[PDB]
Amino acid sequence: TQTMKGLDIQKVAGTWYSLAMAASDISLLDAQSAPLRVYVEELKPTPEGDLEILLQKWENGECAQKKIIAEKTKIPAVFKIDALNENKVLVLDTDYKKYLLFCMENSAEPEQSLACQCLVRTPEVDDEALEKFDKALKALPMHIRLSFNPTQLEEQCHI
Numbered sequence: 012t013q014t015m016k017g018l019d020i021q022k023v024a025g026t027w028y029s030l031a032m033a034a035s036d037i038s039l040l041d042a043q044s045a046p047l048r049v050y051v052e053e054l055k056p057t058p059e060g061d062l063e064i065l066l067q068k069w070e071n072g073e074c075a076q077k078k079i080i081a082e083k084t085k086i087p088a089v090f091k092i093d094a095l096n097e098n099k100v101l102v103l104d105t106d107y108k109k110y111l112l113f114c115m116e117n118s119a120e121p122e123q124s125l126a127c128q129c130l131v132r133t134p135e136v137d138d139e140a141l142e143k144f145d146k147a148l149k150a151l152p153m154h155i156r157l158s159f160n161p162t163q164l165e166e167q168c169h170i
Contacts, residue, residue: 013103013112013147014088020056022107027051027130029169030137031144031158033151034126040155043069043168047115047126049077050169059083062090062100067168074168103147108132110140112147122152134164 029050034040039047048069055063062081067074081090081100090100097118105111110131117124129144131137141158148156163169 013101013150014086015102015104016088018088018102018105019107020060020062020083020087020102023054023062023102023105023111024056026053026132027111028132028134028164029128029159030131030164031129031141031156032126033128033144033148033153033156035122035124035152035154037155039124039126040157043170047124050074050167051128051130052076064092069168074170103127104143110137110143112140112144114151125151125153127151127153134161136161 032040034047039045050067051064052067053065055065057063060083064079064081066077066079068077079092081092083090088102092098092100092115098115099118100113100115103112103114110129112127112129114125114127127148129140131140159169
């Protein structure tokens with residue numbers, strides 16, 4: 012468990028770039044159409060305190076815009092993106108203004124499906140953020156890690 016203490020979810024509002032992403036299984040992130048290959052654009056939290064995510068996911072030969080609600084929980088750094096409320100999104104760490112680390116995990120067999128990202132505010136490769144991402148990662152059963160250059164970060168689906 013790495014989790015962000017004293018997370019003001021309101022301060023994560025706005026634009027983010029999926030600088031890097033890692034997952035427990037290669038097949039979760041290997042191809043463009045892989046199921047956890049998602050690209051965050053914006054985080055819109057509701058006054059309720061729930062969290063709306065605009066993302067892109069490569070879909071029917073097309074980068075597709077998607078909108079998703081992660082529902083809040085008693086834990087402020089932990090949300091539930093609705094399936095059977097099966098998938099938890101945990102915010103591991105953020106400074107609000109440069110980086111944010113999160114992971115998503117399957118409830119049923121956790122290590123079987125776990126993906127995490129290093130989000131940044133700008134399309135620049137932040138060495139500190141990626142350092143922080145790689146040390147949050149040391150402790151986890153990761154088998155695929157991807158990262159993106161500034162050009163790719165300004166393109167839909169990091170293409």
